[PDB]
Design an enzyme around this catalytic site. Sequence first.
Site, mmCIF file in Angstrom:
data_model
loop_
_atom_site.group_PDB
_atom_site.id
_atom_site.type_symbol
_atom_site.label_atom_id
_atom_site.label_comp_id
_atom_site.label_asym_id
_atom_site.label_seq_id
_atom_site.Cartn_x
_atom_site.Cartn_y
_atom_site.Cartn_z
ATOM 1 N N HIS A 1 0.794 -1.228 0.000
ATOM 2 C CA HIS A 1 0.000 0.000 0.000
ATOM 3 C C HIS A 1 0.835 1.291 0.000
ATOM 4 O O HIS A 1 0.282 2.385 -0.048
ATOM 5 C CB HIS A 1 -1.099 0.007 1.079
ATOM 6 C CG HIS A 1 -0.610 0.193 2.480
ATOM 7 N ND1 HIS A 1 -0.066 1.376 2.927
ATOM 8 C CD2 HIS A 1 -0.655 -0.632 3.557
ATOM 9 C CE1 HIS A 1 0.245 1.260 4.206
ATOM 10 N NE2 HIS A 1 -0.104 0.052 4.614
ATOM 11 N N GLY B 1 2.892 6.378 9.489
ATOM 12 C CA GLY B 1 4.246 6.056 9.063
ATOM 13 C C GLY B 1 4.928 4.952 9.860
ATOM 14 O O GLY B 1 6.124 4.704 9.677
ATOM 15 N N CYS C 1 3.775 1.948 9.557
ATOM 16 C CA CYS C 1 3.591 0.845 8.629
ATOM 17 C C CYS C 1 4.926 0.253 8.171
ATOM 18 O O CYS C 1 5.885 0.984 7.905
ATOM 19 C CB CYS C 1 2.777 1.294 7.419
ATOM 20 S SG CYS C 1 1.002 1.331 7.765
#
Lengths: 305, 304
Positions: free
Chosen positions: B41, B143, B145
Amino acid sequence: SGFRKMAFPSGKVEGCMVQVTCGTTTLNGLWLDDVVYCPRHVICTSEDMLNPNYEDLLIRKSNHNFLVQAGNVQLRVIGHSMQNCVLKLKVDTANPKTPKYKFVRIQPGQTFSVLACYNGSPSGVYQCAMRPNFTIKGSFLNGSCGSVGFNIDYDCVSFCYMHHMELPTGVQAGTDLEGNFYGPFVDRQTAQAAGTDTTITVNVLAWLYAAVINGDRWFLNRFTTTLNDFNLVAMKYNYEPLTQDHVDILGPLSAQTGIAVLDMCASLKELLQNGMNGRTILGSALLEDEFTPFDVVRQCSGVTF
Amino acid sequence: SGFRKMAFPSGKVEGCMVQVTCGTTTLNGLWLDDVVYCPRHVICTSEDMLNPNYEDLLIRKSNHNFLVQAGNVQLRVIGHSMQNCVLKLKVDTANPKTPKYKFVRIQPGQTFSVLACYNGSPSGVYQCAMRPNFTIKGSFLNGSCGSVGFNIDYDCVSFCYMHHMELPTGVQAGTDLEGNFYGPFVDRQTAQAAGTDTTITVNVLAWLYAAVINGDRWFLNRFTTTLNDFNLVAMKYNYEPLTQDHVDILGPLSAQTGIAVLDMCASLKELLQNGMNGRTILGSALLEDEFTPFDVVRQCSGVT
């Protein structure tokens, strides 16, 4: 979102942990530059620990009595000395993994990360607070001694704690890296009174703000209070008295949430007086006091190292 | 003595964390050998996340569209591919800090350490359990992730988790390192059902044994029970059913403490039925289920 008891990344400290052995006793040491720091009670036998004359015991010891091991590599001890309750073993090799570091004496109620080790190998990492009574509620088995506590400020590792012993009450006591004990404790096997362990009020409030930031707001009441009136209630429940400095420290969190510090104090007052009625706050059924305001801010802003 | 929620030392993982940027989006990646792993993503904008056709979005992208930064050093991307919900970016340089590692898909109720990062820089470390409903109750900001979860077996790092998203309910979902999601969750911004979050019964029992080992024994009753009768009570309070495998796993702790597993079950039964009456166990006012039997043994034996 989400909020967890979080330790600093331990990589910089892992490279400084070694094994120190003297006779039967084996414990952990901190290798910075060409010096290894460890608890001086490494030189003692179980019997000596009752009433040790450390000066005298140290005199009998020679460089070759101290086996210092870093992983598989064995360091040559070229000198030994005593600074308060810490032993400084000089070695022939500087630690090439030595990070930018400082030794700091931290205040009661402040937090730090502990890298728990056994035989000089890192086992785990967890966040601790120095209790108002200068003990720590940690996790330390035999040979965990010499495991250190630290904070990381940007690029600099600030070593603040070294574990020396467990008290008969099952809590831990230690020194700073200059070897001065936190609190009244000494490195002898005698009965030592830990003081009354009060709750760190400023930390509880910071945690309540963290709760709100993460959308846990049920405890927010309509009431307010004054410092004086709150502290009257705090004293009753063995909570640290709250000062204006404490109020000031919470300012950023107050500003983020739009909840005045004294309004939060009034919420806390009710929680102390009425309990939680079997509810939770951030997945806990009691009031947590091991997050500083700076910890909460750090976690909610996402500071890295 | 003393008993704490403890994470693994993070040093070996810190050396594998990098920053991956694609357009406006920046998140964390895992650099092992000459491959960087991150959430797919990363290629999406805020708009795209509603209903992304990942195949189509990926087609538009070329090697040079992926900025990979390790500290100050910039890695040259010589190939990219998609494996399930993870991107595998091939780089020209092998990570010299690559530890002995494995990718494992962990079972629900098992624990692991998470190294939370932002822009490829480690922020902190904490211990997590995979919930029976395949979510994690972690701590992840924007962020975060691509932050990974792992276990360390002696010298070997076993990566088991990569963070992909937060669900509207405020819990996290992610994949293993082959990019398969834990549970039914997908990498799109839609409402996704988390499912009933049951308590990990075997972990609670392990924790009760840890309590006893640390001299916290007030909850020990005179009663015993059977598996069947205990599980009847467990079902009522949304506890995982206890199996004989679970009983077997607790054997070492049973042997250390001298308390049979079914006797401990009977103690737990009373705690569920009567509550804790405002008491604590190992400084907690509720039953903890994020310690495995192995975790308890590890901490009480002092394994490195």
